[PDB]
């Protein structure tokens, strides 16, 4: 059921943001703590829903994902002016959700009606270089629910990201995240087939003039996302990889290149059980717990891993106790069903 996968995708993103938010300033995270945290959500047997109903507040990740999906539903298509104004109005309505330090400048400029070019604020960020943050990717899952063709997913993931993220390191992260959700919607796959399809798309995109120039300017390997997708392949082939090795090779940072590949690794790794994560947890729950246990950008790596895992496993693996702990879970489910109705 594509409907189950749409609902699972947005629920998975919400879970990642809400559950991961508690650990977003830790840096290093004890898995013992994470397991206690998710256990506090489960009521006594015979009791429906959550022990902590809507107690977990979402952050900027969900606030922007909601605005992006509401824009797609309002216009039945990507509309840069509509989406930019929805981002700016959402920030204005609640500026304290936990936004990036830099991107708030973009919203303040978009709130000025003298600003007519909605892409101009993003271009001015960080001395005209653009943001390479993961804010374009944290919110992009909705693009892959609205556009079925892989060519449209790339085009509109890039344009939606460019409203805040003018660096190719920012917007190619958003494209990679959107492609992972797009692939997850196609259903059962080996890690190898999943990775090879992503590597195929990213090799082509990262050969573009802007992608080569931006990577060169930041002193990075040519085709940096492609290089990290290869590293994911190598890490999946190793018997046992420590969290320290995952973070050393892929990162757990606010940079899109240090978080989007990490999220994809978390999804692929957690297809298999882990001795440190009880078999009581399904694959979606294991992906979120493992993501958060990497520390660093815990709300954002988990929201991206959750979007992919949600699209792949669907609504059957979304636990009622976890979902109903999350602020606005019912609104999130209505948005998912609306995207399915409008676009599928
Ligand atoms: Cl690099
Ligand atoms: Mg956040
Ligand atoms: Mg974050």
Author numbering: 18 to 361
Pull verbatim passages from the article behind this deposition.
Poly(ADP-ribose)glycohydrolase (PARG) and (ADP-ribosyl)hydrolase 3 (ARH3) are the main hydrolases of serine PAR- and MARylation, respectively, thus playing a pivotal role in signal silencing following DNA damage. ARH3 is the only known enzyme to reverse serine MARylation and is consequently responsible for the regulation of hundreds of ADP-ribosylated proteins following DNA damage. In contrast to PARG, the active site of ARH3 contains a catalytic binuclear magnesium centre. To understand the impact of the ARH3:substrate interaction on reaction efficiency, we crystallised ARH3 in complex with the chemically synthesised substrates: histone H2B peptide (aa 1–11) MARylated on Ser7 (H2BS7mar), dimeric ADP-ribose (dimer) and α-NAD+.
Therefore, we chose to crystallise the hARH3 E41A substrate complexes as this prevents substrate cleavage during crystal formation, while retaining a functionally relevant magnesium coordination. Interestingly, while we observe an open conformation in the H2BS7mar- and α-NAD+-bound structures, both the hARH3:dimer and LchARH3:meADPr complexes adopt a closed conformation. In contrast, the ADPra1:n unit of the dimer binds in a relaxed conformation within the ligand site, which prevents engagement of the scissile bond with the Mg2+ ions. Similar to the peptide substrate, the ADPra1:n-1 makes only water-mediated contacts with the protein. The axial position of MgII is occupied by a water molecule (w610) due to the E41A mutation that was introduced to allow crystallisation. However, the protein backbone adopts a closed conformation, and our models suggest an interaction between Glu41 and MgII is possible. Within our hARH3:dimer structure, crystal packing does not impact the positioning of the ADPra1:n-1 moiety. Both ADPr groups of the dimeric PAR adopt a relaxed conformation and do not engage with the MgII centre to displace Glu41. The most likely reason for this unproductive binding mode is the strained position the ADPra1:n-1 would need to adopt as well as the lack of a further coordination groups (like the serine backbone carbonyl) to stabilise the binding. Yet PAR binding fails to efficiently induce these structural in ARH3, thus providing a structural explanation for the observed low hydrolytic activity towards this substrate.
